[PDB]
Enzyme design. Sequence first.
Site, PDB file in Angstrom:
ATOM      1  CG  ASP A 175      -1.616   1.066   0.734  1.00  7.70           C
ATOM      2  OD1 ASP A 175      -1.798   2.094   0.423  1.00  7.70           O
ATOM      3  OD2 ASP A 175      -2.564   1.092   2.214  1.00  7.70           O
ATOM      4  CB  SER A 202      -2.247  14.186 -13.644  1.00  7.86           C
ATOM      5  OG  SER A 202      -2.392  13.874 -14.858  1.00  7.86           O
TER       6      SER A 202
END
Length: 330
Positions: A35, A199
């Site tokens: 994770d 992004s």
Amino acid sequence: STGSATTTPIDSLDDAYITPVQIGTPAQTLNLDFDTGSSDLWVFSSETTASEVDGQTIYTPSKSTTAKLLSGATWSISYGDGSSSSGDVYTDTVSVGGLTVTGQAVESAKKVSSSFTEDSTIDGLLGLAFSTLNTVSPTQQKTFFDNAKASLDSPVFTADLGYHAPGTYNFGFIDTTAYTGSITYTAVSTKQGFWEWTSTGYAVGSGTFKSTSIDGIADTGTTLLYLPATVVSAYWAQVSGAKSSSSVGGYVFPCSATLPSFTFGVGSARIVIPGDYIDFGPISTGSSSCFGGIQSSAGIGINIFGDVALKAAFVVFNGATTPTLGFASK
């Protein structure tokens, strides 16, 4: 040194991925959920409340000659999906794919929430976010990666998750045969303890690319792609009959649909998520309403590039002094 381990979806939907991890001496192999959005290595154990164990493999520290109680240390964690676990701490030898760390903090669960109990395939979590998020008190502990870093050939790990198929976690090297083209690297902020990056935009299907900054985290421990409501609405508007359902808890779409792809930007590069990756199947067995793999982050407080996004790429988690993230197509 290096390590290389195969990671395997837990079910037919790729809800999560498990990776075998050797703990203790002799080795006890547990299948852990790696994770990159948390920083605790915790396991089901001989200390876990018996009624909260249902099929998991447990770590038994008393059977490990290298286990030592970390005296006074406790831990307690809550995840974004509302699940939680807590307990005490041992140090022991931990190996992943041939890479060994001695003195790793292994957090032994005394209690786990129902979602963990109900998932017999996950024996615990191995956190790969920054050690500043580790929950051990009063002495915070380091992640497996942080402990391994100095010994690694290169201070990196990579995630290569499969779509309905196994994939690979590598430590200490970049497998140049595992991706196509080049890797595009992008800046990371560690301010919140995550692999947080920005992004450069998105496209829906064959549509034009929208240049827009989307800050989010690369999180292998989250199944879906969670993005701003504007972006998510633009995606689902291209699917006839798709709608957000408050009763179901997100966007649903007719199971008869063909889903468009979704592209996200990494600098000037583009990663394309095929439409099929966005299908999470019937909301309940036999239903003709299907659950979407792109959902709104509104009310989470952060955008999350979870498995839906990451499995479309070869992803480099560069833990050099100034960390960065790399993405390549594959």
